Structure formats: C-alpha cells, structure tokens
C-alpha cells in the first residue's frame, strides 16, 4: 500500500512511504520523521512492528525539543516504555552548527519522561577531539536536581601546585542534600571536603567538614604545626518565625596555619579567627532576653588568645508608654569572661629564644578573667513637633566586677606598686540632650522634582569622671572618629570604659528625596566641642602609661576633627560614597575615603569600581607591648582598589583588579583574566597575584607573594549547578 507526497500517519511522517506485510515488518522509506511529545527522530528508513510497538530509524538524527538536545545515531529504536535507543549515538546541547562538545557512546538510551540519559562506551569530545573516556555515563535531559558528578575546577597556585576538584553531589531529598569535594593538590595531597545542607519548617543550616593528610613539610617544626589537617562546623538558624530563635555559627580547625595553607578563596587578608557561637534569643514585644555562648579559635600564632563569653545573658527592653509621654528603658547584662593563655616559650636547640608567644606579653591586670554585671536604666522625655524635637535623657550606669587574677599578674602588679581589687563597682549617671530642626525645600534637577531637606542637630552630653584604670578591658574598643561619633553617649564600645564627657555635638545633614520617597543623595557635616579634657583612656593610652613607656594627642583639645560624609546615586546607574575627617588642632587628615561604583541597568555586565581609603587614627591593641596603642606608622591605611568587568565583544568579557598600598609601596593583589560564554559552553580563566597571610617559625607576622591560575570550563547541558569566591568578594557587582 504505497503512498507519496506529504505522507502522514506516536506519528510517523515522511515525504515517501510504502507500507508492507501484515503481522510482519511494516517498513517506511524516504525523509522519515518519527515524532512524539518533545521527541523527534529523522532519517532515511524506518521499520515498525504492530500498531503499537517497535520503531527503528536508520541513519538517524534526533532532537529533544524542551531541552536544547540533539544527536545522531547509526540507528534508533523505540520500544514499549518510549525508551528510545541509539547505536553509535551522539548527545549534545550545542546548536546544529556547533561541535563544541559531544558525548559519543556505543549505546545511548533516552527517557524524556524521566529526564535521564545514559551512554555505554562513552567518549566526551571537545571539537571532535576525544578528551575523556568512561564505560558508562548518565546525564540529565531536563534540568531537575539529580545526583552525580558536578563540573570540575582546575587551578594551579603556589601553596598547592596543580589542583583538581571533581565534586560529587548526593541529591538525598528535596529539602536536604550533600556534596563531596575531593581536592587533589599536587603539592600537599588528597583533601576531602563535605557539606550537608538542610531545610525544615523551623530550621535551616549547613554542616561542613574537611580532612587532608598534608605531605608539605614547609611548616614542620613551626609552633602548633599539624600533619593532619581538618575542619568541621555548623551554621544553623531556628525559629525566624518564632519568638524563640536559636542560632549556631560554630567552626573548629586543626592547626593555626589551616587557612594560610589550604585556602586561597578568602582573598587578601585571609582570616585570623573563626567563630564558635550559639545563641538562644527570646523576642517579646517590648523586651529581648538572650543567652549567648560565644568563643573564637585563632587561625594564627601571632595574635593574643581572645576572651570568651561562656554565659552572656542579657535582658533589654522598655515599658509601654503613652504617646508624647515619658519613656523608661532598661538594659541588663551578666557575662563570664574566661581565657586560657598559651604563653609557652619556644627555645632553639640551645637556650637561645627563637620566638615569643604573644600571650606572654600580657602583664598584670591584662591577665584577668571574671564576671561582670551591668545594669543601665534610663528615662527620657521626647518632645516632638512637625519641625523639630528636644529629647532629654537621664541614665544610670552600675557595673560590678568579680575578678580573678593568676599568680604572675599579681606579682607584676606589686612590682609596679599596685594592688589587685578582685571586687570592683562603678556607678555613674549620664545626661544627654538631643535636639534638632527639620527644614524642607522643593527643587527641580534635570526636570525631575527633588525635595531637599535640611536637618541640623545638637546633642549635649554629660558623664562624670571616675578613675577606671583599676579595671581590665574585656569587650571594649575605641572607635575611630566619624560623623556617627557625634551622637554616641560613649566614645568607647563595650562596658569596661565609660568616657568622661562634658561636650556638645553640632551637625547638619541635607538629603535629596524623589517623589516616591527614594533618596538620591546625602551630605553631612559636624563637629564636637569639648568643655573638659578626656581622661578616661584605654590601658597604655592614659597619662600614667604614656610616661611609663615614654611617648608623646587627642587628649586636651577643645574640638573634635571635622567630620564630612556624603552619598550620591546617579539614576539607577552608578554610585559614589565619601567621608573625610580633618583635625584642625593638627592640620592633618585623620581618615577618609572615596568609593565609586558603576554598573548600569541597561547592561549589568559593565562594572567599574574605584576606591581610595586613608586612615591614620586607629587605636589597636599591641601584641608586643601588651597594651593599646594609637600611632601605628606601619598600619596606616593609604590604599586604592580598582576592579573592572567589561564586555569587549557581546560574548566575551574581561575582568581585572588591582589593589595597591602606598604606605609600603607594594601591590596587595592584582589579577586579570577573561570569561567567554556561548550557547553550550562557558570558560573562565584568571591569572592572579596576591600577598597571603603568613606566620613564620619565629612567631613574627609576615606575608608571602602567591601567584595563581584558575580555570573552569563548563559544558552547559552536561550537569552543573543552579545557584569562585575571591572573584565574588573582590569585585563589587559580580552578580548576573
């Protein structure tokens, strides 16, 4: 029963037809097309069996419509469960004009319903060059989560040599999965990382672990060195929708050099510590109670052992008030600071000292531990109008210490003719008056209406002086001056120092508002006027300690530096942020910064980042003195950061970043590389140089120059992920 023309009849089309014998084979010839839901086979010949049964197209091609999938086979059979099979089959997601990559297997089975394709005697070819063999492979047809290998990552660096990571993904269930990361490192060994992700109706979190038997001996004989390298931790968040909220951020590592050796993904600066925290939080409408157990583990040998807060219990809040009424607030804290000092002495072969442990430079009261309780009620009367406000506030601060000091601290104390009071109290009140005025003005720029505001404010601050030198410092820092300094009731964070203040802060801020309430720009200027000296200081910045070590600033002046600060947004395109702090009493620049960020909304692929940072007024603790310190000539920040990402050709992309430190005249980081994208495959290659954190065997901070090349090819359609890190953090706007 021959047929011709546009023969049509699962649907078996074709230009020609012929049909054949009953119960026997039913053949078909000429431009044959088998079709089905999302399926298509084309070829020269066809053979059917029964009404519902076998099909077999010879010299065939095929196309899976919903995926981008095509291939060819010497022949193709369709069976009962619609499982089509190919012989000498091909599979690819490249366009019909490309041979970018193809999978060629002896048998290739496709199940479009399951979305599962398999191949036996499979080769992966790159531009028809065979690059990888396997006796078996399976791949996904549709883009559902399924377990398997994930796209690998090649690299080569100074710390690891050649590196290969071929992750394996365990798709255990819709709401929890896991991934294995075998890292082969030419220079260290086989490291095995692992992650477990989970999701519940109450909780969400991720487990992480990693092991590696290091073959690198560069750090043999360094303090606290370890041949076995490892890491485990948990992040978890429970009860975001509840008034109870438990939260874990815990990590533990094997040796201090873990991240200095096994990681080049945090970028410059590395990290000196990891967190170990668990927090329970009750969240009521007018008050919050918080149980926080929190400690740090050092990933470094040249920093001092941190305190920990075994139990930190806090209860803050305020009482229901009437509108415009008075307002009562209250904040209460019990904390337990402990710490086990690693002050061991590392000798040479003989008795000569080769290094000093930092904790050994801690003397006297800098070695205390104990309990601190802190109670801080306050009252305030907000008096507001549409155009201004005045809010007076009366606070009372009461802190109690139950200290404990070891033997060496006591001997260090009476060596300085001082005694140790293990029980100390401090009581002092605080008076604060905040006032301001609201001015408005309609304007028009480029034919768009702005509302410009003018907001000037004053805050009088009074806190009596109380010698606090007999107290340790557990949780206190002294922030650098900034415009936000003008409105804080303590020049110190934490509770170990309460600043003596009789001062006035004057400031104004202008804002630019669009019609929808959005804010294009902000400019602010202010200064503080001091009616008394500033006597309360951090240990080693008080007058007694200054002339105990013989130095000498911002102690006795009658005004703060000037504080300027400003932000501007240009349409939805670029953005600029700047701040500047100038000291009139010395005619020098305290700190400053200009940060430009360009990234249009017509094309987020163009990204430019220009940044300058200067800072010379940081107060940091000093490992070798055992005390705090202000002028640190070698820690001055005078740095630029430039980074770019640009599309040279619509499918190519260049990217680079330079980060330069003038204070020492050296590049901190510099890298460049390209990132080409195509229908079926992308490729990213990055040459990189950077200064990595290093603690040498003498307990002295150093840095080493590291170079690296980073390579990732990805064959779209052959597995992958749907959702590098230094490339992410170091270039503002690597988000597409």
């Amino acid at each position: 029963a021959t047929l011709a023309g546009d023969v049509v009849l699962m649907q078996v089309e074709g230009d020609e037809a012929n049909l054949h014998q009953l119960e026997n084979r039913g053949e078909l010839v000429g431009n044959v097309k088998l079709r089905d839901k999302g399926m298509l086979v084309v070829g020269d010949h066809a053979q059917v069996q029964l009404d519902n049964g076998e099909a077999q197209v010879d010299n065939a091609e095929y196309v899976i419509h919903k995926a981008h999938a095509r291939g060819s086979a010497l022949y193709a059979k369709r069976s009962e469960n619609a499982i089509i099979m190919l012989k000498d089959g091909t599979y690819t997601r490249c366009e019909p004009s490309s041979n970018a990559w193809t999978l060629k297997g002896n048998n290739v089975k496709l199940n479009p319903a399951t979305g599962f394709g398999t191949a036996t005697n499979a080769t992966l070819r790159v531009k028809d060059f065979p690059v990888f063999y396997t006796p078996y492979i399976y791949f996904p047809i549709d883009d559902r989560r399924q377990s398997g290998f994930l796209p690998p990552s090649f690299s080569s660096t100074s710390d690891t040599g050649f590196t290969l990571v071929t992750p394996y993904y365990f798709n255990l269930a819709p709401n929890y999965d896991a991934t294995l990361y075998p890292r082969y490192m030419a220079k260290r060994g086989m490291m095995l990382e692992g992650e477990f992700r989970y999701l519940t109706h109450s909780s969400e979190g991720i487990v992480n672990a990693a092991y590696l038997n290091d073959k690198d001996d560069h750090r043999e004989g360094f303090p606290d060195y370890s041949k076995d390298r490892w890491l485990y931790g948990l992040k978890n968040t429970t009860g975001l929708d509840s008034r109870w909220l438990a939260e874990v951020d815990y990590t533990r590592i094997s040796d201090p050099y873990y991240f200095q050796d096994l990681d080049t993904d945090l970028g410059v600066g590395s990290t000196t510590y990891v967190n170990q925290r668990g927090t329970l939080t009750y969240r009521g409408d007018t008050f919050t109670g918080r149980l926080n157990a929190q400690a740090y583990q050092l990933a470094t040998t040249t920093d001092v052992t941190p305190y920990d807060r075994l139990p930190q219990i806090t209860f803050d809040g305020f009482l229901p008030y009437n509108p415009g009424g008075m307002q009562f607030t209250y904040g209460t804290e019990f904390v337990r600071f402990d710490r086990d000092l690693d002050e061991n002495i590392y000798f040479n072969d003989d008795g000569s000292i080769r290094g000093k442990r930092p904790d050994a430079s801690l003397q006297g009261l800098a070695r205390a531990t104990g309990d601190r309780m802190h109670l801080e009620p306050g009252m305030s009367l907000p008096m507001t109008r549409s155009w201004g406000y005045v809010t007076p506030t009366l606070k009372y601060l009461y802190t109690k210490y139950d200290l404990d000091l070891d033997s060496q601290g006591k001997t260090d104390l009476n060596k300085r003719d001082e005694s140790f009071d293990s029980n100390q109290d401090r009581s002092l009140p605080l008076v604060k008056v905040d006032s301001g005025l609201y001015f408005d003005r309609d304007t028009t720029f480029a034919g768009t209406p702005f509302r410009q505001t003018l907001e000037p404010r004053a805050m009088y601050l009074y806190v009596p002086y109380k010698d606090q030198d007999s107290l340790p410092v557990f949780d206190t820092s002294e922030p650098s001056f900034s415009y936000d300094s003008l409105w804080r009731e303590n020049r110190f964070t934490g509770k170990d120092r309460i600043g003596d203040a009789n001062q006035l802060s004057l400031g104004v801020t202008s804002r630019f508002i669009e019609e929808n309430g959005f804010e294009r720009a902000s400019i602010s200027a202010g200064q503080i006027y001091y009616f008394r000296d500033r006597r309360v200081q951090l240990p080693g910045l008080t007058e007694k300690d200054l002339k105990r070590l013989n130095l000498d600033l911002d102690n006795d002046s009658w005004r703060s530096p000037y504080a300027f600060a400003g932000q501007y947004r240009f349409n939805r395109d670029w953005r600029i942020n700047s701040d500047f702090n100038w000291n009139p009493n010395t005619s020098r620049t305290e700190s400053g910064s200009a940060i430009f960020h360009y990234q249009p909304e017509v094309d987020p692929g163009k990204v430019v980042n220009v940044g300058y940072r200067y800072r010379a007024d940081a107060r940091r603790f000093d490992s070798s003195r055992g005390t705090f310190r202000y002028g640190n000539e070698n820690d001055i920040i005078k740095q630029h950061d430039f980074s770019v990402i640009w599309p040279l050709v619509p499918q190519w992309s260049v990217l680079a970043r330079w980060q330069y430190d003038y204070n020492k005249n050296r590049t901190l980081e510099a890298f460049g590389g390209f990132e080409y994208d195509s229908c079926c495959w992308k490729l990213r290659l990055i040459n990189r140089y950077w200064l990595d954190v290093d603690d040498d065997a003498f307990l002295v901070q150093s840095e080493k120059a590291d170079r690296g090349i980073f390579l990732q090819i990805v064959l779209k359609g052959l597995g992958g992920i749907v959702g590098e890190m230094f490339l992410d953090k170091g270039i503002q706007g690597y988000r597409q």
Binding site: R145, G148, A173
Partner: peptide, 12 residues
C-alpha cells in the same frame, strides 16, 4: 549530576 536549591516535598 545536577545540584539546585532546597525546597519542600509536594504533599498529595
């Protein structure tokens, strides 16, 4: 293999 975001199982 193909890794993606977590999500809750359909219930029916």
């Amino acid at each position: 293999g193909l890794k993606g975001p977590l999500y809750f199982p359909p219930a029916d």
